[PDB]
Amino acid sequence: MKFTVEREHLLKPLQQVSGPLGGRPTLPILGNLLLQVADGTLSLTGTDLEMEMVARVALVQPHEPGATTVPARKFFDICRGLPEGAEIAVQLEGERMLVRSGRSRFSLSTLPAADFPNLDDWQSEVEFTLPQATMKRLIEATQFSMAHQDVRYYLNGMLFETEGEELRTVATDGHRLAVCSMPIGQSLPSHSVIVPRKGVIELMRMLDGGDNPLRVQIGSNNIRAHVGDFIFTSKLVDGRFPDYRRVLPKNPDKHLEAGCDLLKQAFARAAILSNEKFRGVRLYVSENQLKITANNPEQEEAEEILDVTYSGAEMEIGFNVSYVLDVLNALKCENVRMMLTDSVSSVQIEDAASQSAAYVVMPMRL
Amino acid sequence: MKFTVEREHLLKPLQQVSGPLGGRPTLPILGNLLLQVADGTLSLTGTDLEMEMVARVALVQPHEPGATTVPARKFFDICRGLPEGAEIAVQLEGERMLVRSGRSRFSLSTLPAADFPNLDDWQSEVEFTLPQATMKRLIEATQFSMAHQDVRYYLNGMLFETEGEELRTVATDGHRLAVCSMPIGQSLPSHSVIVPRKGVIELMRMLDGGDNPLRVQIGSNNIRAHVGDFIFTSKLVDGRFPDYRRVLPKNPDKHLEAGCDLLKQAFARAAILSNEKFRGVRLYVSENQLKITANNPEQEEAEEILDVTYSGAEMEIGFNVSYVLDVLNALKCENVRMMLTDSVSSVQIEDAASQSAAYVVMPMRL
Amino acid sequence: MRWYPWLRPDFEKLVASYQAGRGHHALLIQALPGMGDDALIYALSRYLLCQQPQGHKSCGHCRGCQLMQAGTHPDYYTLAPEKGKNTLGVDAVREVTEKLNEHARLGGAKVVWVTDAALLTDAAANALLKTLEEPPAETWFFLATREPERLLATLRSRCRLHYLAPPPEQYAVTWLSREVTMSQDALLAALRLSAGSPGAALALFQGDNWQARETLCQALAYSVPSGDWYSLLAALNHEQAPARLHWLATLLMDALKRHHGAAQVTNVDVPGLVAELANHLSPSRLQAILGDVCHIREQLMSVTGINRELLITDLLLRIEHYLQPGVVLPVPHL
Amino acid sequence: MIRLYPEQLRAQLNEGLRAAYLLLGNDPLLLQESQDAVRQVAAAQGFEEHHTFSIDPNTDWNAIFSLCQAMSLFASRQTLLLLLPENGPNAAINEQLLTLTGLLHDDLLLIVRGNKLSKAQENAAWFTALANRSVQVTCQTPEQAQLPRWVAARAKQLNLELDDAANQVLCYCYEGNLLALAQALERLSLLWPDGKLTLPRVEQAVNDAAHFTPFHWVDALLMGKSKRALHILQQLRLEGSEPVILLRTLQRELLLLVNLKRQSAHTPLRALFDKHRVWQNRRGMMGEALNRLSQTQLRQAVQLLTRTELTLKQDYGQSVWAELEGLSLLLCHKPLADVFIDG
Amino acid sequence: SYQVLARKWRPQTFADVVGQEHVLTALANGLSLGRIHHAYLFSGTRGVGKTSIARLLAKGLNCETGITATPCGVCDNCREIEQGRFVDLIEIDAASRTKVEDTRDLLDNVQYAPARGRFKVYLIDEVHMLSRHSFNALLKTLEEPPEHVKFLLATTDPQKLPVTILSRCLQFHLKALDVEQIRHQLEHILNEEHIAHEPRALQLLARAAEGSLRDALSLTDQAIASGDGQVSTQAVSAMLGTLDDDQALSLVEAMVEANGERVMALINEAAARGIEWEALLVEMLGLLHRIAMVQLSPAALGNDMAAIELRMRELARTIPPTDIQLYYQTLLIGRKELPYAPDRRMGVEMTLLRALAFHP
């Protein structure tokens, strides 16, 4: 059993797995990396008691099945010490692994592989595949509304909802809702799950928007995604995410269309003089008119007027300018449609070109 | 009060006046810039009490004379955030300032101009024009030697002495004195004033190699510089700069002329091969020989031998490598002459061709 | 930790509840020190986390059992005070609750072990109350405390209380005799001293506590006739002062019971000292001194950072003052 | 290797300057005046540089080395002052000091200021090396007994006239604050050029600005002067000093006294003092404290101290100073029925 | 999924709650009349219906059919509140959210309109754990909040809160449930659960509940687990360590008649049988109170103790009332200090010896 490795190909999975790993795992073996070999491939796996990230790479040279554990810090130091572009020779000899660096031999502590918290068997409840572009678009549309730290634990993640041919992502923090749904091409059972903050953040920072589609399988408790040679699995929460249909306005009569660029520029210009902490603005909407006003604790008034299309009455709506700016930034379209009922009701934002995504903002009451 | 300008003309002067003005202000009004329109010119002063930067712009619209103070940060943000090419019309209503730009309106709170710290009517003791090149040369020649942090507050800056048709700058940090003189061309009364480090730094920042004649006004305790339509006023640091006349050796009979580039590369090699701190390098100069040795009692002596053009008496002096390196960097030429009296004396460095600037350094006792 | 024989029945009972799926999510074990409640909690957690349990005992070879042996199970979030401290903060409870807030990695059950709820801070206990009221599905808690009365009323209300009674006195005596080779009188004295909880008596024998008790008894024997109780401080000033105060209180109680007439005494190993203490002091003096000793022991235990030697010498001086005739003796009163 | 005092340091400077100087002690005024005199004598000799540095691990040493190995561009024979840390030199500071002694140059005038070193800190390589040319000026603050003579000498040097009452008032108002004492003397001299300072003169232009330490309070309680104990307690309270350190310092001596009194029934005092290895100067003080109070006291005192600690760190009140002054009065020859203090 | 009786039988309507008639009537009348306050503080002992009543009020306020005194419990919002999902019902733990940022964001998000319901209910639990600065910052919100937020405050003891908080909140004192109410609720729950039960067992469990119904349900679950799924008198007695015999009376007689050896032997055998010491002290206190009552009025004695009537009567004829009061006082003192004693046995023995010291 000889392990021959190339430094250039070795680099990348090691960095990806060591990313989540910290300086102090708080356990003797949690920071250790599980290296296993089966058939003609080897998998390098890392866990932090709440996720598992495994990179699988094939080989050409013969070998035998096995599994072992290697410290991450010492392994990284050994890799760094070796000259770039060299070959790494590892041997499983007794209780201590033997690494041959040229004419030098070094002994590294080894621990049993049966003690590594890794899944031996996996069961999937709903499985499918999608291009990375679909997931990237959905997350970019929905994640910015995700809550960071709220007592309502169910509201600090993202709801993945698969219904028939449609896949949807929903997020909210009690003040703003972002929903993004579109077809995937294959029918699926009506299943809804919640992915936490860390899962979505890791998926985003790991996703590269490549042409190779990734497969996602969601079991009873966990969600696993395999893209290319990487597989990342996290554990869900199932906090019974609130139904997104109700929070949406019920038949909003007052609809107004505006230019996305003009509206975003107007809101950005208003935000400078708005309350730097509350960040509240007022919108006087009237016939083909939108007057944006902002005040400061120092009584600094900022007013601007925008020409839009609107056939409703005159009303005044309070908003958080930061949330509106985030929605506009995540929108990235030429036209924006705002639907509302009254000053004391949530206001919905969509695009006329495509309704695949929608957002809802809760107004300000003083 | 009323005027109208273009944000293109105000983006630069606002940045200039608001540049030095940073952090919290000692007095609230010091956090506000004073803008005054009169006789077709708008002057904005970003006073910092110790320093005052005034930027003047031309007004062609039908303005109205008047002065007022307004916070610099938010006004600059308002000017910058408007669409490119938009014209800004400013008016005063009551105690507030109204800013109009096309369809956008803003209101700002303004303090009375009376409470603004008035620039006293002190008459300049010595006023004179000067080209930018001479001032820049003087600053470059007499800025590396001033102490950055010294208990003697008067040594932090450098002393400008005007005598007859001559302006001289002397800088020191307790070990070396660099003195550079330039004939003004106009006879002026004798006067010496110390300019602080920050003042000279701001002055050299203002220099841009333009054709505008830089007018310098030296007062009892204030130095003012006019460049085109920009004014920079600083408060002279008090104290009494030590006289440089006594420092200059009378008859340094021993002379050493050598290629400036050769000494530069020798010092660079010594420094890179003697990166260890402390232990000033000892140079033994002899007939057509210069051996620089590291004083490090622990590190191996990285002795370096060069063939200088010296043919006088031989001696070893324990100089500081960084000091001589900086002094030679300040004198960028092909040849350099150093004159000394004996083992214990102040060696004076000068250009073998030019002698206007003198670099009287002293050896580090060993 | 060790699994003592007397844990066999109670465990076999508790697991039976979990065998039926009706086990209580919050379990509070009321066990004295040395009763091995930690072993019981560990066995219950092992059974709960076993993937393919057989009968009552865990299989020992499934993934859950392997992780338990390795002590790195993603579930099983234990709560305990820091090694350098003696109390559990609210931050630890917060992070453990956050970890429990989501599904188990193995898909089985999540277990939470509070090593000692008595050390739990008021804020920490109040934070734990919410998760204890309505734990997520397949979430189990295993608290432990010597005196449940010391815990908050709410926290005790949430939990299902299981009292781990000690074995019969003869059984504990013979178990200790088989374990430690020492006179049966000393074993019985230690068992009665440890509230009849074997293991705690075994721990006392294992350490130098027995020699400390002998030294304290000799010092008290010297002091009682001469009346120089101050010398007792030499045998009392130590990091284990509460235990020594408990020993002194038991000696005084034995002397008082001998005065009132009794057939059994906790400190059976020293009949002479008990007899001398009972003879040389009146029952009122014995009662006053015993009450003072218990009060000072309670003050030392409850109060943090109190000057040990100062309190001990104050107690000794007050005891000497009581022995003086004509001095009013205080009586306990709420 | 000459140990001197600031009073006679002027003559030592006049007869000739020394290569090494170091001021060791705790008195601020004496240290300041010695430093000023040395610096003025150096300036008269022709030393224009007065570099000052504070020893601390955060502070660097490259500047110090460069300045000690280099002269001044417009001066010569520099002078360097080192402010030792309050705790004292450590191993790194010892290495730095011996390094400085290694390359020390005659033209450099070395001055050192800081708290007086201990016996363990007294011996060192740099200290022994400098001993060949070291003059150390003891700068301790004079005791209460030495205060009246010191202030009388200070006033006489200022050509003033002080009577016994004025000397006592000055000692009471500025005990341990000799800097404020000298400032008050200067102020009184300015106010009354005649130079005769009677009791009304001093008393109408003085303020209570004395500074003390808990050891002084314990000493006052041992002596038994109620007025001094109350005054020092007031000063410590106004200084913001926490009562925990006072309680601990009192407790140590209280336990020592209790042990001595209880074990002195049939044991010679000398043997107990030798075994306890207490300060020789404190033997008579401990004897006076022991014979001043009997076993009837030292019992309510301990109970009172325990009650004070409990009410301090359990009730977290602000009446701790009242209990402290009550205990102070108790330790003196006072009735102190203890019903008020709940001893 | 199986749930404990406390979670299973949490009231879901204003009629399912037992006791606390006054507060329920006040809440129902306020909801019906529309005179609803913005701050409801609930004060009372544990296990009396703080969270239950707060959640019922939240459901009534947030019901989709308007503000109703008795919420239906079937709406989307009603069901979400019942399941702890309603976003507008923010359940905050005071102990956890003591940091400055927590309260600052708590009072900063009030301006945002409710996501789903008509009121953004804030259910703050154990409000007495909040810091003083938290109360000071929240005074303004508690005084004049916007007309879309209601603060529901729950605390075991209200006196610890700042007086201003009590001033700005409507205080509802949840009375501790009596023995009869607890017994009736347990009987109803067991009947609805198809579990056989004996009247003696229910009475003992209600007595041991100490006025808290959650504790009663926990004890019932413990008996069910230990009682092989049967609430039997013997099983409950064994679980609770209740003497319900003449041992307590014999020990009281020995204590009154001095005879320390008898008291020590009784305590030794009681410890051997492994009984609950607090139960023994409570039994002694009850016996002493009964003796005092019969001394005052002989007719105040029941027939349950008929087998021990005459002997008990003898005490009423032999012990003067002052001695009875002394013994009761000593037993209560022992009760107070029993938890803090080095051992339960030591505490009981000290109490009994102190009582023995007393004599005519």
Next chain:
Amino acid sequence: DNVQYAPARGRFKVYLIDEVHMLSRHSFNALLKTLEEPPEHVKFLLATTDPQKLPVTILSRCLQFHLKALDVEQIRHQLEHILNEEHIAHEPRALQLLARAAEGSLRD
């Protein structure tokens, strides 16, 4: 920092600080200078339930007004007046009980 600016529309820029005793000692010392010599268009209205916690300098820099706990009769009269204005039936004994319950705080 913003005190110097003129009031928006009102004739004075009144400040009303609630529970001023909660301010730290450093905050009080910083506030001392503005309290002694505030701008002519600025008024401070401090309020606190416990005035003994304030520094002596703060107390001397401002006019103190110690509101007294309202009398039971005054509380009863106010309750009767408001109930009569709201057209609500009431009984004298109920008002007496309510006034007794409210020690001196009319809000209670």
